[PDB]
Amino acid sequence: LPKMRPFDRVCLDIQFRRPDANSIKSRLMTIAIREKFKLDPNVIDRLIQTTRGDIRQVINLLSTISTTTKTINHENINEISKAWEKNIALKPFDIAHKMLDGQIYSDIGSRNFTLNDKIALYFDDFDFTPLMIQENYLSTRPSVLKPGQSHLEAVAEAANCISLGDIVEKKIRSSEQLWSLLPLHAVLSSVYPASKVAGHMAGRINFTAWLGQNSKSAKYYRLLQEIHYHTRLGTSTDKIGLRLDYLPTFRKRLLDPFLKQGADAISSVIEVMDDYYLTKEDWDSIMEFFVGPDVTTAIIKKIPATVKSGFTRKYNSMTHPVAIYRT
Amino acid sequence: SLWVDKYRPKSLNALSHNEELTNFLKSLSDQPRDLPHLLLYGPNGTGKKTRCMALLESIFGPGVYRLKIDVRQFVTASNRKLELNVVSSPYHLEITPSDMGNNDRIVIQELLKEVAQMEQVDFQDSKDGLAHRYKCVIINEANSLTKDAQAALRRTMEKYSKNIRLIMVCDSMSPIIAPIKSRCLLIRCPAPSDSEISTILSDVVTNERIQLETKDILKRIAQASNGNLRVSLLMLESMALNNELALKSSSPIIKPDWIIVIHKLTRKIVKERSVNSLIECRAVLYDLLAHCIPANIILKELTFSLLDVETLNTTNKSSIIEYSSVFDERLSLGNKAIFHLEGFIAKVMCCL
Amino acid sequence: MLEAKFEEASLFKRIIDGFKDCVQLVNFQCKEDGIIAQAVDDSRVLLVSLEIGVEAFQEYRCDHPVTLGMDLTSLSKILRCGNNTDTLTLIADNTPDSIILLFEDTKKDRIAEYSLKLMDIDADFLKIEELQYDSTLSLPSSEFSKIVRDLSQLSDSINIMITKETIKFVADGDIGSGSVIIKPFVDMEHPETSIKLEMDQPVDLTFGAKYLLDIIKGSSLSDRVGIRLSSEAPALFQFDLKSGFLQFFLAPKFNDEE
Amino acid sequence: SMLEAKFEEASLFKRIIDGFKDCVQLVNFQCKEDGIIAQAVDDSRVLLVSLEIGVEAFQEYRCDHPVTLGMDLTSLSKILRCGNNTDTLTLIADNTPDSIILLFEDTKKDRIAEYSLKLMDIDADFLKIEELQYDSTLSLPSSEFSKIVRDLSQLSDSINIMITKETIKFVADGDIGSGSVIIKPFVDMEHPETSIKLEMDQPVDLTFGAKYLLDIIKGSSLSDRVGIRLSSEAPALFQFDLKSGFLQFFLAPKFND
Amino acid sequence: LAQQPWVEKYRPKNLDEVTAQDHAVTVLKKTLKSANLPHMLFYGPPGTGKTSTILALTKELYGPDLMKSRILELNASDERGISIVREKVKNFARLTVSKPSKHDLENYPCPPYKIIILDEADSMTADAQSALRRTMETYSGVTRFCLICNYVTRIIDPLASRCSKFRFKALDASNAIDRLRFISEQENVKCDDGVLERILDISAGDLRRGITLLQSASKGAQYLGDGKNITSTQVEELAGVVPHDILIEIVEKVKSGDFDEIKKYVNTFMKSGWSAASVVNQLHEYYITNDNFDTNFKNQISWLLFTTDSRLNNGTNEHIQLLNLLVKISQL
Amino acid sequence: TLSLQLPWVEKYRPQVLSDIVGNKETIDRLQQIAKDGNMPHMIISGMPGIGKTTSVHCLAHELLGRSYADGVLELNASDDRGIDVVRNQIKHFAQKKLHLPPGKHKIVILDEADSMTAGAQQALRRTMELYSNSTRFAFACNQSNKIIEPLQSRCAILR
DNA sequence: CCCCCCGGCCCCCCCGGC
DNA sequence: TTTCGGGGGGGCCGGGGGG
Ligand SMILES: Nc1ncnc2c1ncn2[C@@H]1O[C@H](COP(=O)(O)OP(=O)(O)OP(O)(O)=S)[C@@H](O)[C@H]1O
Ligand SMILES: Nc1ncnc2c1ncn2[C@@H]1O[C@H](COP(=O)(O)OP(=O)(O)OP(O)(O)=S)[C@@H](O)[C@H]1O
Numbered sequence A: 001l002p003k004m005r006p007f008d009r010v011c012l013d014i015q016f017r018r019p020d021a022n023s024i025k026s027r028l029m030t031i032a033i034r035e036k037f038k039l040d041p042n043v044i045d046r047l048i049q050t051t052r053g054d055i056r057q058v059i060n061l062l063s064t065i066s067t068t069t070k071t072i073n074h075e076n077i078n079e080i081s082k083a084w085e086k087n088i089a090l091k092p093f094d095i096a097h098k099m100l101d102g103q104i105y106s107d108i109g110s111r112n113f114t115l116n117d118k119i120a121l122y123f124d125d126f127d128f129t130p131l132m133i134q135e136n137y138l139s140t141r142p143s144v145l146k147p148g149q150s151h152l153e154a155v156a157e158a159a160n161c162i163s164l165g166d167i168v169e170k171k172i173r174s175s176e177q178l179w180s181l182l183p184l185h186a187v188l189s190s191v192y193p194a195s196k197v198a199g200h201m202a203g204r205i206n207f208t209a210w211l212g213q214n215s216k217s218a219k220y221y222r223l224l225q226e227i228h229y230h231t232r233l234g235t236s237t238d239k240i241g242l243r244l245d246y247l248p249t250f251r252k253r254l255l256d257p258f259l260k261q262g263a264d265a266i267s268s269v270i271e272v273m274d275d276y277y278l279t280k281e282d283w284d285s286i287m288e289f290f291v292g293p294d295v296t297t298a299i300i301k302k303i304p305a306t307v308k309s310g311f312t313r314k315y316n317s318m319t320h321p322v323a324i325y326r327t
Numbered sequence B: 001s002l003w004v005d006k007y008r009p010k011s012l013n014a015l016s017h018n019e020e021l022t023n024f025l026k027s028l029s030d031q032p033r034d035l036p037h038l039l040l041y042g043p044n045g046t047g048k049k050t051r052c053m054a055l056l057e058s059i060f061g062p063g064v065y066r067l068k069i070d071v072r073q074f075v076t077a078s079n080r081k082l083e084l085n086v087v088s089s090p091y092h093l094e095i096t097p098s099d100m101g102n103n104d105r106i107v108i109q110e111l112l113k114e115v116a117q118m119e120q121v122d123f124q125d126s127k128d129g130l131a132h133r134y135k136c137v138i139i140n141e142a143n144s145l146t147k148d149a150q151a152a153l154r155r156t157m158e159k160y161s162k163n164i165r166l167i168m169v170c171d172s173m174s175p176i177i178a179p180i181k182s183r184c185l186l187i188r189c190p191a192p193s194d195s196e197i198s199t200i201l202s203d204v205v206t207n208e209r210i211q212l213e214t215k216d217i218l219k220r221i222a223q224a225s226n227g228n229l230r231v232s233l234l235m236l237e238s239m240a241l242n243n244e245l246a247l248k249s250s251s252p253i254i255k256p257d258w259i260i261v262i263h264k265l266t267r268k269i270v271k272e273r274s275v276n277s278l279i280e281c282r283a284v285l286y287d288l289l290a291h292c293i294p295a296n297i298i299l300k301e302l303t304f305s306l307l308d309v310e311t312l313n314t315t316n317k318s319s320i321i322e323y324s325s326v327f328d329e330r331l332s333l334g335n336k337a338i339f340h341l342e343g344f345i346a347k348v349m350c351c352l
Numbered sequence C: 001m002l003e004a005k006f007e008e009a010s011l012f013k014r015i016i017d018g019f020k021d022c023v024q025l026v027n028f029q030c031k032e033d034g035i036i037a038q039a040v041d042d043s044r045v046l047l048v049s050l051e052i053g054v055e056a057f058q059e060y061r062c063d064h065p066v067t068l069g070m071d072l073t074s075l076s077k078i079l080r081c082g083n084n085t086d087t088l089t090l091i092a093d094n095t096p097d098s099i100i101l102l103f104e105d106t107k108k109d110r111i112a113e114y115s116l117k118l119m120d121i122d123a124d125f126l127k128i129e130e131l132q133y134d135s136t137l138s139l140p141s142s143e144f145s146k147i148v149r150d151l152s153q154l155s156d157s158i159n160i161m162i163t164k165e166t167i168k169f170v171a172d173g174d175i176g177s178g179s180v181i182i183k184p185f186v187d188m189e190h191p192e193t194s195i196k197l198e199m200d201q202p203v204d205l206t207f208g209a210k211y212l213l214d215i216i217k218g219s220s221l222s223d224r225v226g227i228r229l230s231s232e233a234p235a236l237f238q239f240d241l242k243s244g245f246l247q248f249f250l251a252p253k254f255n256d257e258e
Numbered sequence D: 001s002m003l004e005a006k007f008e009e010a011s012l013f014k015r016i017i018d019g020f021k022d023c024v025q026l027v028n029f030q031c032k033e034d035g036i037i038a039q040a041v042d043d044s045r046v047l048l049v050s051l052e053i054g055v056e057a058f059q060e061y062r063c064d065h066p067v068t069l070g071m072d073l074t075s076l077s078k079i080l081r082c083g084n085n086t087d088t089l090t091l092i093a094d095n096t097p098d099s100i101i102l103l104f105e106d107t108k109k110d111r112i113a114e115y116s117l118k119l120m121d122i123d124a125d126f127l128k129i130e131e132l133q134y135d136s137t138l139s140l141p142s143s144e145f146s147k148i149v150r151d152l153s154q155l156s157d158s159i160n161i162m163i164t165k166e167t168i169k170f171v172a173d174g175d176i177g178s179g180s181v182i183i184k185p186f187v188d189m190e191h192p193e194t195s196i197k198l199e200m201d202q203p204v205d206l207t208f209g210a211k212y213l214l215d216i217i218k219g220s221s222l223s224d225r226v227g228i229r230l231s232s233e234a235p236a237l238f239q240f241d242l243k244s245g246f247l248q249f250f251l252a253p254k255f256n257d
Numbered sequence E: 001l002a003q004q005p006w007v008e009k010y011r012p013k014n015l016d017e018v019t020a021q022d023h024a025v026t027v028l029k030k031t032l033k034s035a036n037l038p039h040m041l042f043y044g045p046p047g048t049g050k051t052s053t054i055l056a057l058t059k060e061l062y063g064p065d066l067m068k069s070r071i072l073e074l075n076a077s078d079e080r081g082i083s084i085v086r087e088k089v090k091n092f093a094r095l096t097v098s099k100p101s102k103h104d105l106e107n108y109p110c111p112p113y114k115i116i117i118l119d120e121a122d123s124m125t126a127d128a129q130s131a132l133r134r135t136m137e138t139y140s141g142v143t144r145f146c147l148i149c150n151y152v153t154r155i156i157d158p159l160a161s162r163c164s165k166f167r168f169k170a171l172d173a174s175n176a177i178d179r180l181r182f183i184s185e186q187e188n189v190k191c192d193d194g195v196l197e198r199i200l201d202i203s204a205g206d207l208r209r210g211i212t213l214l215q216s217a218s219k220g221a222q223y224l225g226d227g228k229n230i231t232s233t234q235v236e237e238l239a240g241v242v243p244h245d246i247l248i249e250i251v252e253k254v255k256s257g258d259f260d261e262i263k264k265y266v267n268t269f270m271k272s273g274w275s276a277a278s279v280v281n282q283l284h285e286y287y288i289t290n291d292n293f294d295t296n297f298k299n300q301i302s303w304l305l306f307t308t309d310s311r312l313n314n315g316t317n318e319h320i321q322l323l324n325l326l327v328k329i330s331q332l
Numbered sequence F: 001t002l003s004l005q006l007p008w009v010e011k012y013r014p015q016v017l018s019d020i021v022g023n024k025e026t027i028d029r030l031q032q033i034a035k036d037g038n039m040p041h042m043i044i045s046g047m048p049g050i051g052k053t054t055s056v057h058c059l060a061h062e063l064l065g066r067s068y069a070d071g072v073l074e075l076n077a078s079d080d081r082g083i084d085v086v087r088n089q090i091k092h093f094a095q096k097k098l099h100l101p102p103g104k105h106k107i108v109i110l111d112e113a114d115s116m117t118a119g120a121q122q123a124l125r126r127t128m129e130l131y132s133n134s135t136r137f138a139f140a141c142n143q144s145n146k147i148i149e150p151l152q153s154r155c156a157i158l159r
Numbered sequence G: 001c002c003c004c005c006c007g008g009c010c011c012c013c014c015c016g017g018c
Numbered sequence H: 001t002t003t004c005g006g007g008g009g010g011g012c013c014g015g016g017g018g019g
C-alpha cells in the first residue's frame, strides 16, 4: 500500500507466505486426536484452500464443525468448504486477468461465472478496473470471435463501448452525482469490451499508463499557462494558439541562434526574452514542448558548455522586466 | 518583437481587411452610450481580438492599450485556493474563466458581479473623481465556458446593463447556449482574402527589408495558412529566419511539428491496419496529448489528412467523415479524450 | 542620503498595517517634505493615500526625492520582528535594490536592524484635487469601529445619511435592520470624544461592509476618524497622523433602483 | 405604539433569554396588560419552556391590546449582543406587527441604537399546561440540584429520580459504575435559603435524559432555589422563581421498558 | 434612456405591455382582484417575456415601495444548493408579510403574501427541488413561489405538480408585429414594407433578438446618414443569414455528388464564418419546401437534418458536422 | 384508540433457540454451543428478516441467564460506534471483571456491523485477541464483504 | 487575576452498486 | 484523477467556571 512507502528502506522486510497444507497437517492431526473427532488427512488440503492458508480460520472451522459433526470425511467436505469459503477482493492485476479470460464467457463458463459475478468483480475495485481493461484489451488472443469476425473488428467494438462508458462516467461524476449509474458503467467500461476480446493474454499484463500521462499533461499545461501569462502583454492569442503557432517561431528566435553563431547570439536572445518578459525557466519550459522532428533534448545537450555558462552569466548579470508581480 | 505582434493595428482606421466589418464597427462606436452586449464569432487568427481592441479604442481613448496583469484569489466550497490572472486597463477588464475549468462559474458569480454591482473611482479625465461610464469586460474563449457559468451570466447581463457591457469572442457559437446568444449582438468575423493576406505580408516584408525574388512566394504562404493571418505572419517570419532573411521561389513551406506528427500518423494508419498498428497509434496519441495539443484539434487534423489521401475511394471517405462526426460528438460529451481518439482510429482501420 | 529616524517605530508599524489589506504594492515617494503615497486598488473602486510629514519623524532628511516600490507584506515582515520602543531609520543609497531599516533603541543592545528589498512598481500622476464635499464629520475611531462591527453582522451594505442634526447609519439585512443614529455631541469634561459635524447639503450613500471593515481595521492611527461625503464624488475616510494623514476614497455602490 | 415595555437595564432580559436559549430555537411571546407569557418547544418535542414576566419587572409597561410575536432565539441573542448591558432596553411593537423594535438607550450620552427584528408566522396555543394535584412536590437550592446533576451526568446519560417518604434519591447507572445521592427534608432557621422541603402523596419514580437536565440547570442563575413537581403519567415540572415572574421547564420522562 | 439598450429600455413596465401572452396574463390580472395567486411555473423558449411578466406582476401587486420587502429573487448567478434551500428560502418563507403603509393599501391591492422567484430553476439540482416541495406546501398562506425555466423537463415531477403551469408561446410576425412596430415608431426608424416581418421571421420566436437586430439596423442607418429606408438585405446580412446565391451553390455542389468538390467548397465556405445552425436551417427550408423531390428523399433528408441539428446542439465541430451532412445528402 | 397493540413480529419473536425456523444445522450448532458454552467469536450473515438478530439474542440470553444485564454489551447502527468508542468503551467492557459460571463469557453484540468503518474494525482486532478468556464477540451483518479480512479470520462464519 | 474544563467551529480525508 | 453531499475524526480557539 502507498501508506507504507515511508518504511521502504528503513527496515528489514520479512515476508510471510501462506503456509502449505503439508506444513500444518501434523498440527491438525494432533488437534483432532486431542479433541476426539475424526479428521481424514485427505480433506485437509481442501480445508486449507477454503481458508486460503489461514491457520486461525481453519482451527476455528474445526472447532465450530466438531460441536455437532464428529467426522470430517470426504462426504461432507464439499458442503463445509462451500459454507466457509472466503471472499477476498481481487487486486487490479487479478481483476484484469480474470475479466479477459475467454473461458468465463463461454456458455458453460457463463453458467458457472455469471454476469452478476462479473459486475461484482468490477466492483471489487471500481476506480481501477476500467483503466486496466482499457489498457490491456489490445493485448490478447481472442477465443470468442464470431464467425467471420476478425480481431480488429472486435477491438473496434470494444473501443466504441469504452468511449460510451467514458461518457457515462463523465455523467456519474458531474454536479448531479448520479452514482446510481455505477452498475451501468461497469458493463460499458469493463464487462462488454472484455467479452468482445476475451481470451488468453498475449503478454504480460500492464498497469494503466493513463495516470502518468495525465499528470504529465497537467504539468505541461501549467507550464504553458505560466509562459502564456508571462508573454500575454506582447502577443495576441490564447494559450492553445501560443502552443500551436508562436512557439515554433520563438524557438527559431531562441534556440537556432545558439547553433549558428555560438556565443555571439547571447545578447540577441536576451533581447528577445526582454521583449516578452521571459525568463530562463520559461526558456527551458518552451524548449521542452516540441515533439516529433523538433525534439531539442539532443540539440540542447550538444550545445557547448561554455556557451550555456556564458548565457547564464549574462542573464544573471543584467536586470530584466517583470510582467506579473508576486505570481 | 515578432512581426506578428510588432505590426498589429491599434485603431479601426488601421484595419486592412473586411472593410464592411470596419464600417459596421465604426457605426456601432458612433454612439457607444447604448452599445449592447457583443459576441464576435469567427475563424481563429482572423483578427477578432484586434477588432475588439480597436472598437474599445474607438469608444474610450488609446489608454485601453495600457494593460496590466493582476492576480485574484478565489475559494471553493471545499476551501480550495484558486488563482485567476486578470488583464485590466483603466477602462476595461479581460478574463478567461475557462482557465479554472469547472470552477469558472465561481469567477462569473463572484468577480464579474463584483464589477457590475459597484462604481469605480476615476481620478483622470473626471472632475468629480467618479467614473461616468460603463465598464467593459472581455471574456476570452467564451465557447469554453461551462453551461453553469453561461447560465450565471444571464441575469447579470440584464440587471446591470447600466454599469457593465460584455464583449465575448469565440471561434464557434455551437457551444454557446441559446439564452446567451439571444442576449448578445452577434458579429461575424470572416477570414481575410488571399489578396489581403498577400498585401499585409508584402507590407511587412517592405518594412523589414526582406529580399523577395517574386511576390508569388507571399501568395504561396497565403494559401498554406488557410485564412489564418497569425499563422501566415509567423510562417513568413520563420521562412525568413530559415533563409538568412532572403526568400526564394524554392523556399519550402514550413509546417509545425504536431502537424508533421499527425501526417505521419495518417500515413501509418493508411499503410498498416492491425492491432499492433493500433497500439503504436495509441502511443503517438499519448505523446501528442501530453504536450498540450487539444484532442479536438488532433481529431480534426487527422480526419482532414485522411480525407486528403489520394488512394482512398469515396466509400472510405464517407465512412471516415461519418466516424469523425460521431466521435467528435463523443469527445464533446466525455472526459478521457484518448478513449474516443482510439475508438475513431479503430473504426477507420476497420473501414479501410 | 534619505532617512526618516522615527520617534517610535510602532507608529510606522501601525501606519503600514492600516492599509495592508486594501493594497499591497504601493509606491512611496520620500521627499524632504515627507513620505507620500497614492495607490489605486486592484478593482479600481478604492484609493489609498498616505502622508507622513517631516515633523512626525524624530530626524528626517532627504538630498534627492526617491520613489521606492517597497512591498507592504515584506515591510510588515521587517517591522513585526522589531522591538516595542525603537527609532526606525530608513537608510538607502544612490542605486538601492534594498533599503536598510535600522531598528535602533535608547539602549545599545536592543537593536533589530534588518534589510528590505525594493520592487519596481509603476506610478502615475494621480490627482486628488480638492472638491467641495457636501457634508463632513469627525467621530471617535472606537465608536466607528463598534458601529461597523455591529452593523456588519446584519448586512454587507451600510447606508449613511447626513441630515439636519442627524447622522444615520443603517444596516438592512435578511434577519432584520439596525441603526445607531448619532447627533452632534459635545463634552466639556472630555472634548476629545466630542462628535463634530459641518453639514451643507443632504447626502445619502451606500457602501460595502467589507471595505468599511477594512478601513476601520486601520483606525489605530488616530482615536478619531473623519468622513467627508459628496453627492457626486466618492466619500473620503481620513485618519489624522502626527503630521500627515491616511485617507481612503471608496466608490459607492451603484444605485440600481435609482 | 401598540406595545412599549422598558427594562431599566438590558442585563435582566439578556439573563432571562440566556436561561433557556440552549434548549429551544423558536419562541412565541404573547404580551397583554398583565405582562409577557412566552412558550417554546425543543426540536425533539421532549422539553417545553414556559416563561412569565409580570408588569412589575418593567420600569414602564404599556400594552393596549394582546399581541403575539413569533421569533427565533438565536437571532434575538445575536441582536441583544449588539447592545450594551448598561443601557435601558425598550421593546416596541405595533398593531398586527411584522417586526419587533429593540431600543438601546444610554442616558449618559446621546447614543440610541434601534434594532428591528422580523417576526415569523407561528400559529400556536400555550395550552396552559399545569397538572392540578401532583403526586409529589419538593424544592431545594439550585446549587445543590446543579451539583447533583453534573455529578451524575458524568456516569450515565440517564438519571432516575425517586421520591419516597422523607427521601429524595437521584440515581445514575453507567458503563464505568453507578452513583446514588440521597437527601432528606430539613429546615434551618439560621439560613432558610439552604433548606429543602418535600410534600409527598404517593411514591414516585421517573427516569429522565441527562442532556435535558443539564440544559435545565442553566436556569439556576435566575433563582437561588428550584422547585420540582413530579407525577406519574405527567411531565416533570422544574420551576425557577423570578422577581415578578417564573421560568418553567416541562420535561417528559422516558418510557419505562 | 439613451444609455440603455433597446431590449432593457423597452422592457414591459406593466402586464398590459406584454404582447402575446394573453392566455396567462389574463389569469394573472384576474388574481389582482381574486387575491389567491397560486404557485406558478413559467416555461417557454428564450426571449418570450417570462421574467418581464413576473416583474410586472410584482410591480402591479405591491407597488414601487413595498415590492422590495415582499420579493425574494434567486437566479443562476446565486448559489442555490440544498443547504441554501433548507435555510435561507425556508427562513424567508416562514417570515410574516411586511406591514403595508396607508399609501400602499389605498393605492395597491397589497395581497397578504410574499413572492419567492426562482428564476432559471432548471439549473437547480433535484435535491434542492425535493427540499423545496414541503417548504412551498407548508407556508402557502404567507408565501407563493414562481419557478421560471426554459426546459420544463428539468423540473422534478412533484414541483411541476405543485405549481400551476404557464407556457409562454413563441413570438412571431403574427402576434408580435405590433410591439416591434411601436418600438420602431418611438425610435423613428424608417423601414421598408415587410422589414419588420422579416426580422421577426429571422428571430424565430425570440423578440429580444428581433429588437437587438432592429437596433443594429437603426445604428447602421444612422451612421450611413443617407435618409433611406432600411432594406431587408442589410437586415439579413446583420442576422448572419447566408446569401441565397451561396445556398444555391451548395445545393448544386451537393447535386454533383463528388466528394472532393464538396470537401473543397465546404473548406472555402467555412472561412466566411457562417454559423452551422443557420446553414442547416436554410438547407432544411430549401429542401422541405421544394416540389422537385420525392417522398422518400424528403423522408431521409428530414432525419439527416434532425441528426445534424442534434449533434450541433451538443457543441461539436461545425466543419465536420456540415461536411458529413452535405456528403450524406449528396448520396441520397 | 390511544393504546397500541404489540405487532405479531415482536409479540411472537422467538425467545428460545428452539423456536427459530430455518438453517437447521447452524441453529443446532448454536444450541450445542449454548448447552456446552465456550461460545467462539462469530459472524452471522444473510439477507433481511431471516432470524439473525433473534438467534444472537436468544443465544446470549440462554448462555448468560440472569447475568444478561451485566455480561452483554449491545451496539448497533443507531448507536455511535466510532474509533473512540471502540478504543474506550468496548475495551473497558472487555477488561471488566465479572463472575460467571465456569463455561460462560461476556458477550459483545455488534448488530449491523457492516456499517462500522475500517478503523474501528482494525481497533477491534487485538481487543478480541487479548481478552478472549473473558469476552466473546458476535457480529450480525447483511453483507459479509464489508467486514475486514482480519476480523473474519478471528471469527466463525455462519452464512 | 490566572489556570483548567469542555462545548463549538474549523479543517482534512474518504465513500458514493446490490 | 475528479466537477457535491454526507460522514467521521483530529487540531485548534475560546467562553465559562473555579481557585
Ligand atoms: N412578451 C413580450 N412583450 C414585450 N417584450 C418582450 C416580450 N418578451 C420579450 N420581450 C422583450 O425582450 C426582452 C427580454 O424579455 P424577457 O422577459 O427577458 O424574456 P425571457 O423569456 O424571460 O428570457 P429567458 O427565458 O431568460 S432566455 C424584454 O425586455 C422585452 O424588451
Ligand atoms: N427464523 C425465524 N423464525 C421465526 N421468526 C422469525 C424468524 N426470522 C425472522 N423472524 C421473525 O421476524 C422478526 C424479525 O426477525 P430478525 O431477527 O430481526 O431478522 P434479521 O435477519 O435480523 O433482520 P435484518 O438482517 O437486521 S434486516 C422476528 O421477531 C421474528 O418474529
Ligand SMILES: Nc1nc2c(ncn2[C@@H]2O[C@H](COP(=O)(O)OP(=O)(O)O)[C@@H](O)[C@H]2O)c(=O)[nH]1
Pocket: A236, A237, B004, B005, B007, B008, B009, B014, B015, B016, B017, B043, B044, B045, B046, B047, B048, B049, B050, B051, B200, B229, B230, B233
Ligand atoms: N495589417 C493587419 N493585420 C491584422 C488585422 N487583423 C488581424 N491582424 C493580424 O493578425 C494577428 C492575429 O489577429 P487576432 O485578433 O489575434 O486573431 P483572433 O483573435 O484569433 O481572431 C494579429 O496579431 C495581427 O497582427 C488587420 O486588420 N490588418
Ligand SMILES: [Mg+2]
Pocket: E050, E051, E052
Ligand atoms: Mg428570463
Ligand SMILES: [Mg+2]
Pocket: F052, F053, F054, F111, F140
Ligand atoms: Mg437484525
